[PDB]
């Protein structure tokens, strides 16, 4: 239930954010207080990405 796919490329902006590429899979650890940011893991590492830049995949 934690497997997601990226909707859009996102280039890290520092501050423990994680670059992700459209169509690539990621596993979600959780969210920040407002829900706007999502802490995720990919083959490239771990960090924060926008919550509405990702979606579940079976």
């Amino acid at each position: 239930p934690n497997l997601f796919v990226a909707l859009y490329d996102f280039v890290a902006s520092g501050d423990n954010t994680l670059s992700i590429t459209k169509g690539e899979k990621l596993r979600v650890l959780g969210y920040n207080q407002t829900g706007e940011w999502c802490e995720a893991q990919t083959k490239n590492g771990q960090g924060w990405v926008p919550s509405n830049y990702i979606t579940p995949v079976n």
Partner: peptide, 10 residues
Amino acid sequence: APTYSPPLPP
């Protein structure tokens, strides 16, 4: 998480 909001979706 960052204290600033993320970028909006394209």
